[PDB]
Ligand binder design. Structure first.
Ligand SMILES: *[B]([O])([O])[C]([C][C]([C])[C])[N]C(=O)[C]([N]C(=O)C1=[C][C]=[C]C(C2=[C][C]=[C][C]=[C]2)=N1)[C]([C])[O]
Ligand SMILES: [Cl-]
Ligand SMILES: [Cl-]
Ligand SMILES: [Cl-]
Ligand SMILES: [Cl-]
Ligand SMILES: [Cl-]
Ligand SMILES: [Cl-]
Ligand SMILES: [Cl-]
Ligand SMILES: [Cl-]
Ligand SMILES: [Cl-]
Ligand SMILES: [Cl-]
Ligand SMILES: [Cl-]
Ligand SMILES: [Cl-]
Ligand SMILES: [Cl-]
Ligand SMILES: [Cl-]
Ligand SMILES: [Cl-]
Ligand SMILES: [Cl-]
Ligand SMILES: [Cl-]
Ligand SMILES: [Cl-]
Ligand SMILES: [Cl-]
Ligand SMILES: [K+]
Ligand SMILES: [K+]
Ligand SMILES: [K+]
Ligand SMILES: [Mg+2]
Ligand SMILES: [Mg+2]
Ligand SMILES: [Mg+2]
Lengths: 244, 220, 230, 234, 239, 204, 202, 248
């Protein structure tokens, strides 16, 4: 124990002598290969997803570079980690949701969609022949009873709902930023949700963003359809922040 | 069979008779035709009895699995889709004709579901061999937004019409009243039919029946 | 395709090491406790709950299987969600046939059988969890544990996860057969207090109870109330 | 090394050793030559004989009236592929009542032979073919490899010491399009003869010839039937 | 060792077998695409490995639907199999939905197929990268590029194979948003001649194709006369 | 009609703390009697019996297949099956053949193995169950059986009176049916014993 | 049943009667036969209630998933194609006479018929169901190129009313819908609001 | 995938099957379990491993399983494996009963299971079941019987034997005390307690620590009973009194 290894326990998802799954641990490292960080925050009125948008190559059509994805009309997502893996996971989520609506006559709750994707990822941690997906999914939507929701699932098949959360390279630092900010708030609840998200991201990276360097997605109690902010809309937030 | 349902101001009233027949013989005088789907959703059944029993049990069971997972009260639409998609798949070979009613987060809902898988969402419906007698009562007397007791009166009148005018229907009237606040499964609601009494007694004393052979096996 | 060979095999000393390593994942999990009182069962568990950022209500460790049966675990959470799903399904298959709720012991046997499969069947590892399963039937409470081998045991009281050895001796010197459920809840929470670290709130432990009326989670407000004495 | 036993394992250089090893089976087969003019496609092959009393291995196979092949590598793989080709040809005559165009047959081969290069526990085909055909676009010579790549050729040689035959063909290829049939086959033989040890010669026992063109269905010439073509290498 | 299966992550979270497959594409000669005002043009440096081969042998430019061209680099048998997958997907889309598959959807679908070969010990990743190009009045010009991991993006200009970077730096000099396909073919030929290493690999064919307003949204080979002029322009520009 | 090919009749009846179940004894093929001691009532427990009428081959198959399932049930569980649970087990067995059913329509009679409360039920050939508090009948003379049971049955009968009623209901009912009879067997099930009788009966 | 749809410049109008029958019993007198398949695409259903409900739910699923994937509104032509595929493939097991109509940004208002058997044809206007027989001569005489939305509504309401009077399997209320870029506007004509044409007494 | 396959169903160079052997080591460490045939019955006696104070006691035994009307078994080795096998035994016994309408003869039941075990050593690439069994029964062909089967898929009949911890020692004591053709249930019970007294050398023997089942015939019916603790204590007492006599 303490970093012990027997047999093929670093190559496939069998247990190591401490009871760890090294291949699952290595899939969390794959999340950071991309070099990106995402943040998500929920208030009483809305939920927001913010992520870095890095377009190093001028020859890219930057309108095709996104990590924000519509899953249904009311459920949005930000993906962090290996891109092709992420896309595949987004497709599966779209399928699960559409399937749920066809069979059950009402939209999949965000918690259930996150649970299902997490249960599917679980299978990759117990069966030896395939690897986990090296990506992390954060889902936002409005629940009719519970209000705005933020849910995250990971390559271990763990999932949870959050007041706010993060993924990718600066996840820990974001978690500290967000933790410290909520303890301050009455009823431990965020209120300026887009500003908190962008500020968190901006601090942990030390950047001070241009509007083309981030992407912003929202769902609101008044407007539950998932919406992507334009550059101008993001700029209005950036400017309003800069001026106090 | 006569089964029926109404949407009233605060909920649903379902009704049913209690006769089951085999050919033109009464096999059960007190069959229970209003089946549990979930604590907030019930379903009257007509048609082939094993089919209505098994279909409602299966969907109730699958709904319980669903609500255990979701942690939420199930929806009437969800029962309706599951029932109708299964019945369609079987092409009308599962002879279940259903009246599905309940109360979910979006309020009261009532559907009739046919064996071949069509459904109709409506504020009053009837099914079974007595369904036209029951529907006459509804067309004549139904009003939107009835109070609970008026709704209960109307349903039980409609079931009575089927009981008295259809040879396939009889015996008792069962009701199930479902609101946001309450579930009243009223079995029997009314007993409008009773066997007459027995005028002559046939108490056959021991030895009346001749016996060829006898074995007593004692038990623990 | 799928690997068709077993990933658990016998070592030269006759041990199934993958199962022993699964048990080590269980031993490193967050603590769980179950106590069978005279008139019911309590299941209690610690949340490995960092952050105030967690919505503690969003996922539960203490879960209903049927109206009369509930579960908790120690070990890997996602493995546990598989077994919760199969247990629910098994309970419903039984109910469809027999039109009676599945007896607790019959549900444990069938779940334990699924865990056995994952110790032999092709291309898979064992489950890295142990389950504590509570239930009430035949007018009587039941507490079972089911481990990664598929072995199961009936307990009066036990502990699993981190610091379980001490938890069991804490319970050994504190459980009596004539004990009530309200007292049992108290001693269950004291057992978790033995190995806690953090200061307990109603948001970072979970408690479930089972009696004649059925199985249910205690609400945060109910747990808060029991935490006043502690 | 750890990279050479599975067709599914890329090496760190971006190569697949199993495919390269399969190509070696073709390089060690006996040489064959294929070339074409405006009107004919010809195959010429050296047949290896195990002992002095053995017949000499068939190298040239009939596929359809308009298509024949010469082989190098694993004979069992050559037959399996040949049987696939034959069936694809019969299918197209059955369906459409016209010959399968040669370039489409070759595409089908590329697609079929690629599949086992990408699945664990499968192996490449260990055979290379020269394909002679004639259709609406005229005569053709194609080459196929164990890598599943294929090539459209003015002329070609594969097998042991084929480099020599290839040089000869490059040297004289500007003459081929305008050649009459006899000239073209002579050229094929001269290319093939370059592959031989200096001592040894083309004989009726070791040479096999295949010809197809505008007025001629794919035909194989062996033994005494090659003598017309060998007399007047003068 | 950690690099023998696509179903094994390394301890740093990499999938070396996908990286190795990428190295096969980077060993290949260079292909480029450029999107412009009224379409998309493709050019490939097509190394001729023997003078015995016909002109046009081993094409690296394919029609995958009437409106969609494909340009490849890497292992050519894998690319061709991918061209078949793309064809089948465009064909199936037309059968099911009743209209020509939008480029982006086709790109995403074939990318998911590429992706599926990066998860398993049972199969190996594809050793090819490819570009897809189309044009329509409704969607305008579109150029996507997919790699062996299954990533798919859209581009103004793109290059794959061994002189990828040198090619990109030349492509960046163009104001392609304001140019026509007729202008861009010359520049494509120019760029292939710039990045071609004439010392190390001796002979090549330029392969050109385009799809735009001028072909009415059909992907077509650049006509012979126009290619020869573009070559002549490229060659004299090298001077 | 498939159900009349062999003929036959079973019934069951409830009394105070006891149940009774009865059957005719004929095995025949259309008009022809083959045997007169054919078994139709099978023990499923010390105090729990199932009676099957219908096509004789399916009477035997269902009893045998049911026993298979029950034995596995009892070995696996702690315990003797409850009457209601047997019913459900049989329902499930018959409904699996919903689209090619066994041609038999059973009755069950017994006492709860712990509480000793009386239970009777019947099921149709596809497994629809029917519990009653008085009696149940199945066979080619069901109408005759109904007429006798409706006229004679009374609540809360002691073992002796239950025996006389079920016996007179069976004998007189099957005497109006050509393809049932050739004897009657009656089991009375009490807490502390089973009493099995064959009745003096017409043999035509 | 009687179903109809009509194209106008910018959109479509759809209509149906509301009668479901089993033999000559009316099992629903206020059926909604116009079913939304996407935000601006409806189908009018005739034939088997079970079949057309199952097919419509299936196509709604397919179209919704396709639309999310493409991130654009679906084409009316796509919705019609998906009905056609399913109605043609299963033509031996279904009884479904469908009209698909709606609006999309590329082609505007469109009407397609998918009659039994599963052929698909675009039309200026379409009618179907058992009652359509009785209005061929009326629609052929009354149809004019270039009708406004309002004219399409009246034309539809009149045609349906005429069919309903004559066809025992049609009747009840007239449900109408207009679809355009701006959205979907639904209404019901009941009782006195249904257009009225005298019985020809002596 | 060839790299990860541990190849559980292949020979080693001496003609051995390593997994099978290895499974047999697992068994040797498990609870001691003995069977003894007598003229009027057969018995099983087993060391319990479920003995922690806080255990609840809910089934009628820990390691004794009823198979059908006329047969029972006990097990040593991996418990979950034993559950799969005993379930399969019950199924085979009911299949035979369904088909023939008579109980499966004991040896036939054993053989049927052993063929399943055998298969797991020859094909399928799976680990074998880590279980040895003792089977007791009565049938109409050979009366009272006792069998033993192991993970190789081998079985035999025995008059007395032992599997699990300290087996060799237990068999020596049986070799020396067992009277072929002359034992009764009452004397077999004495001998079983004698044997367990010696082979549980860690430490002092208690009724909480053993399980005894007897199989006898009464009024044409097989009776299978797990002895209650009152009786087990009484036999322990009689054995302890008997050893007091041992010298004078
Ligand atoms: B219209 O075409 O006349 C109308 C359109 C429909 C609502 C989409 N169709 C009908 O009214 C048809 N009726 C049914 O399909 C129907 C409804 C309820 C039950 C049954 C049924 C079917 C078989 C056996 C029993 C009952 N059918 C009608 C024209 O057939
Ligand atoms: Cl849907
Ligand atoms: Cl805030
Ligand atoms: Cl619905
Ligand atoms: Cl009815
Ligand atoms: Cl395998
Ligand atoms: Cl679940
Ligand atoms: Cl339950
Ligand atoms: Cl709960
Ligand atoms: Cl060769
Ligand atoms: Cl060979
Ligand atoms: Cl090659
Ligand atoms: Cl070669
Ligand atoms: Cl590249
Ligand atoms: Cl069976
Ligand atoms: Cl039609
Ligand atoms: Cl129509
Ligand atoms: Cl109507
Ligand atoms: Cl048995
Ligand atoms: Cl038996
Ligand atoms: K894995
Ligand atoms: K309808
Ligand atoms: K009408
Ligand atoms: Mg049909
Ligand atoms: Mg008679
Ligand atoms: Mg007679």
């Amino acid at each position: 124990s303490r970093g012990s290894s027997a047999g093929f326990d670093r190559h496939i998802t069998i247990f190591s002598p401490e009871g760890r799954l090294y291949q699952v641990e290595y899939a969390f490292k794959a999340i950071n290969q991309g070099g990106l960080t995402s943040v998500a925050v929920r208030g009483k009125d809305c939920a927001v997803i913010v992520t870095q948008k890095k377009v190093p190559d001028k020859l890219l059509d930057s309108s095709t570079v996104t990590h924000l994805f519509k899953i249904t009309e009311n459920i949005g997502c930000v993906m962090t980690g290996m891109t092709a893996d992420s896309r595949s996971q987004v497709q599966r989520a779209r399928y699960e949701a559409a399937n749920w609506k066809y069979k059950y006559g009402y939209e999949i709750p965000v918690d259930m969609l996150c649970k299902r994707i997490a249960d599917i990822s679980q299978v990759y941690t117990q069966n030896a022949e395939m690897r986990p997906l090296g990506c992390c999914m954060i889902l936002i939507g409005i629940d009719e009873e519970q209000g705005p929701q933020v849910y995250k699932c990971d390559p271990a098949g763990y999932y949870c709902g959050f007041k706010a959360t993060a993924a990718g390279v600066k996840q820990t630092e974001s978690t500290s930023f967000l933790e410290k900010k909520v303890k301050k708030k009455f009823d431990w609840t965020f209120e300026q949700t887009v500003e908190t998200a962008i500020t968190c991201l901006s601090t942990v990276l030390s950047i001070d963003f241009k509007p083309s360097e981030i992407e912003v997605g929202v769902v609101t109690v008044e407007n539950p359809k998932f919406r992507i902010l334009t550059e101008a809309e993001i700029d209005a937030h950036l400017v309003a922040l800069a001026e106090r | 069979t006569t089964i029926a349902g109404v949407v009233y101001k605060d909920g649903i009233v379902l009704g049913a008779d209690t006769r089951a027949t085999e050919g033109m013989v009464v096999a059960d005088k007190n069959c229970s035709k209003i089946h549990f789907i979930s604590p907030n959703i019930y379903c009257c059944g007509a048609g082939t009895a094993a089919d209505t029993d098994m279909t409602t049990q299966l969907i109730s069971s699958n709904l319980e699995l669903h609500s255990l997972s979701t942690g939420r009260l199930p929806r009437v639409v969800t029962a309706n889709r599951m029932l109708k998609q299964m019945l369609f798949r079987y092409q009308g070979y599962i002879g279940a004709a259903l009246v599905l009613g309940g109360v979910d987060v979006t309020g009261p809902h009532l559907y009739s579901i046919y064996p071949h898988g069509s459904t109709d969402k409506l504020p009053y419906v009837t099914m079974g061999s007595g369904s036209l007698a029951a529907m006459a009562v509804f067309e004549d007397k139904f009003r939107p937004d009835m109070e609970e007791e008026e709704a209960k009166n109307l349903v039980s009148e409609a079931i009575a019409a089927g009981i008295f005018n259809d040879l396939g229907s009889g015996s008792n009237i069962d009701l199930c009243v479902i609101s946001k606040n309450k579930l009243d499964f009223l079995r029997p609601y009314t007993v409008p039919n009773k066997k007459g009494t027995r005028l002559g007694r046939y108490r056959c004393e021991k030895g009346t029946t001749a016996v060829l052979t006898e074995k007593i096996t004692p038990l623990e | 395709r799928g690997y068709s060979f077993s990933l658990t095999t016998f070592s030269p000393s006759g041990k199934l090491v993958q199962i022993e390593y699964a048990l080590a994942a269980v031993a490193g999990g967050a603590p769980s406790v179950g106590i069978k009182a005279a008139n019911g069962v309590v299941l209690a568990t610690e949340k490995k709950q960092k952050s105030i950022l967690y919505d503690e209500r969003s996922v539960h460790k203490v879960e209903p299987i049927t109206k009369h049966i509930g579960l908790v675990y120690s070990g890997m959470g996602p493995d546990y969600r598989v077994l919760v799903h199969r247990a629910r399904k098994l309970a419903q298959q039984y109910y469809l046939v027999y039109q009676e709720p599945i007896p607790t012991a019959q549900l444990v046997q069938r779940v334990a059988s699924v865990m056995q499969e994952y110790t032999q069947s092709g291309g898979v590892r064992p489950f890295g969890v142990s389950l504590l399963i509570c239930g009430w039937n035949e007018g009587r409470p039941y507490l079972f544990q089911s481990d990664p081998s598929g072995a199961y045991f009936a307990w009066k009281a036990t502990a699993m996860g981190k610091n379980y050895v001490n938890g069991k001796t804490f319970l050994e010197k504190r459980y009596n057969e004539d004990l009530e459920l309200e007292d049992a809840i108290h001693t269950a929470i004291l057992t978790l207090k033995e190995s806690f670290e953090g200061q307990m709130t109603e948001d970072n432990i979970e408690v479930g109870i089972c009696n004649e009326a059925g199985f249910r989670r205690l609400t945060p407000t109910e747990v808060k109330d029991y935490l006043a004495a502690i | 090394n750890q990279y050479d036993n599975d067709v599914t394992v890329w090496s760190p250089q971006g190569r697949i050793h199993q495919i390269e090893y399969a190509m070696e089976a073709v390089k060690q087969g006996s040489a064959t030559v294929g070339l074409k003019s405006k009107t004919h496609a010809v195959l010429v092959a050296l047949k290896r004989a195990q002992s002095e009393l053995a017949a000499h291995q068939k190298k040239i196979l009939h596929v359809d009236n308009h298509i024949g092949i010469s082989i190098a590598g694993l004979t069992a793989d050559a037959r399996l592929l040949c049987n696939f080709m034959r069936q694809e040809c019969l299918d197209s005559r059955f369906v459409f009542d016209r010959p399968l165009p040669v370039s489409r047959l070759v595409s089908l081969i590329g697609s079929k032979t690629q599949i086992p290069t990408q699945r664990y526990g499968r192996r490449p085909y260990g055979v290379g073919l020269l394909i002679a055909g004639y259709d609406d676009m005229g005569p053709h010579i194609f080459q196929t490899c164990p890598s599943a790549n294929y090539f459209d050729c003015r002329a070609m040689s594969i097998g042991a010491r084929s480099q020599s035959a290839r040089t000869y063909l490059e040297r004289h290829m500007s003459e081929f399009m305008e050649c009459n049939l006899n000239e073209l086959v002579k050229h094929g033989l001269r290319a093939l003869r370059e592959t031989l040890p200096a001592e040894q010669d083309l004989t009726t026992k070791n040479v096999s010839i295949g010809i197809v063109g505008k007025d001629l269905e794919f035909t194989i010439y062996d033994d005494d039937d090659v003598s017309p073509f060998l007399e007047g290498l003068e | 060792g950690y690099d023998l299966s696509a179903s094994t992550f390394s301890p740093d979270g990499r999938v070396f077998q996908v990286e190795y497959a990428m190295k096969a594409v980077e060993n290949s000669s260079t292909a480029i695409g450029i999107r412009c005002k009224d379409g998309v043009v493709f050019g490939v440096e097509k190394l001729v490995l023997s003078k015995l081969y016909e002109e046009g042998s081993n094409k690296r430019l394919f029609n995958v639907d009437r409106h969609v061209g494909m340009a490849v680099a890497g292992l050519l048998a894998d690319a061709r199999s991918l061209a078949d997958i793309a064809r089948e997907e465009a064909s199936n889309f037309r059968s099911n939905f009743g209209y020509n598959i939008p480029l982006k959807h086709l790109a995403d679908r074939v990318a998911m197929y590429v992706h599926a070969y990066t998860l398993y010990s049972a199969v190996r990743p594809f050793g090819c990268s490819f570009m897809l190009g189309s044009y329509s009045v409704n969607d305008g010009a579109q150029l996507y590029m997919i790699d062996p991991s299954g990533v798919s993006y859209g581009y103004w200009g793109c290059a794959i194979g061994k002189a990828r970077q040198a090619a990109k730096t030349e492509i960046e000099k163009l104001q392609m948003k304001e140019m026509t396909c007729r202008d861009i073919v010359k520049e494509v030929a120019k760029i292939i001649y710039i990045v071609h290493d004439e010392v190390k690999d001796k002979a090549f064919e330029l392969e050109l194709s385009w799809v735009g307003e001028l072909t009415n949204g059909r992907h077509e080979i650049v006509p012979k006369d126009i290619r020869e002029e573009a070559e002549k322009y490229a060659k004299e520009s090298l001077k | 009609s498939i159900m009349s090919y062999n003929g036959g009749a079973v019934m069951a009846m409830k009394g105070k703390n006891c149940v009774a179940i009865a059957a005719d004894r004929r095995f025949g093929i259309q008009a022809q009697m083959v045997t007169t001691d054919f078994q139709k009532i099978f023990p499923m427990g010390d105090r729990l019996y199932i009676g099957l009428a219908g096509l004789a081959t399916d009477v035997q198959t269902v009893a045998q297949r049911l026993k298979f399932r029950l034995n596995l049930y009892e070995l696996k569980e702690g315990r003797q099956i409850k009457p209601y649970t047997l019913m459900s087990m049989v329902a499930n067995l018959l409904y699996e053949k919903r689209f090619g059913p066994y041609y038999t329509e059973p009755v069950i009679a017994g006492l709860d193995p712990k509480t000793f409360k009386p239970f009777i039920c019947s099921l149709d050939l596809i497994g629809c169950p029917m519990v009653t508090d008085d009696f149940v009948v199945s066979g080619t003379c069901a109408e005759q059986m109904y007429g006798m049971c409706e006229s004679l049955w009374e609540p809360n009968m002691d073992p002796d009176h239950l025996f006389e009623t079920i016996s007179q209901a069976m004998l007189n009912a099957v005497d109006r049916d050509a393809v049932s009879g050739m004897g009657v067997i009656v089991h009375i099930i009490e807490k502390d014993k089973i009493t099995t009788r064959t009745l003096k009966a017409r043999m035509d | 049943t009687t179903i109809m749809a009509v194209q106008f410049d910018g959109g479509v109008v759809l209509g149906a009667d509301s009668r479901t029958t089993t033999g000559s019993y009316i099992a629903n007198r206020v059926t909604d036969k116009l079913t939304p398949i996407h935000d601006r695409i409806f189908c009018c259903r005739s034939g088997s209630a079970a079949d057309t409900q199952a097919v419509a739910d299936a196509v709604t699923y397919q179209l919704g998933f396709h639309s999310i994937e493409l991130n654009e509104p679906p084409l009316v032509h796509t919705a019609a194609s998906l009905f056609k595929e399913m109605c043609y493939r299963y033509r031996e097991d279904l009884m479904a006479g469908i009209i698909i109509a709606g609006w999309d940004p590329q082609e505007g208002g469109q009407v397609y018929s998918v009659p039994m058997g599963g052929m698909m044809v675009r039309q200026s206007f379409a009618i179907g169901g058992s009652g359509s027989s009785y209005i061929y001569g009326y629609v052929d005489a009354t149809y004019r190129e270039g009708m406004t939305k309002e004219e399409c509504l009246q034309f539809t309401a009149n045609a349906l009313a005429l069919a309903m009077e004559r066809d025992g399997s049609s009747g009840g209320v007239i449900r109408l819908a207009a679809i355009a870029e701006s959205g979907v506007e639904r209404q019901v004509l009941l009782g006195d609001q249904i257009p009225k044409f005298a019985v020809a007494t002596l | 995938s060839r790299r990860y396959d541990s190849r559980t169903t292949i020979f080693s160079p001496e003609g051995r099957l390593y997994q099978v052997e290895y499974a047999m080591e697992a068994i040797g460490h498990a609870g001691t379990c003995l069977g003894i045939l007598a003229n009027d019955g057969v018995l099983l006696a087993a060391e319990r491993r479920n003995i922690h104070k806080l255990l609840d006691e809910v089934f009628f035994s820990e390691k004794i399983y009823k198979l059908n009307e006329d047969m029972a078994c006990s097990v040593a080795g991996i418990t979950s494996d034993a559950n799969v096998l005993t379930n399969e035994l019950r199924l085979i016994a009911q299949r035979y009963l369904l088909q023939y309408q008579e109980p499966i003869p004991c040896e036939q039941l054993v053989t049927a299971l052993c063929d399943i075990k055998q298969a797991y050593t020859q094909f399928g690439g799976k680990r074998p079941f880590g279980v040895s069994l003792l089977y007791i029964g009565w049938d109409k062909h050979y009366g009272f019987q006792l069998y033993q089967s192991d993970p190789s898929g081998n079985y035999g009949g025995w008059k007395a034997t032992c599997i699990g911890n300290n087996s060799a020692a237990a068999v020596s004591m049986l070799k020396q005390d067992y009277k072929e053709g002359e034992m009764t249930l009452k004397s077999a019970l004495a001998l079983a307690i004698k044997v367990l007294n010696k082979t549980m050398d860690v430490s002092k023997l208690s009724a909480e620590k053993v399980e005894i089942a007897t199989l006898t015939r009464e009024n044409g019916k097989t009776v299978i009973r797990v002895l209650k603790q009152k009786e087990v204590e009484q036999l322990i007492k009689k054995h302890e009194e008997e050893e007091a006599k041992a010298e004078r």
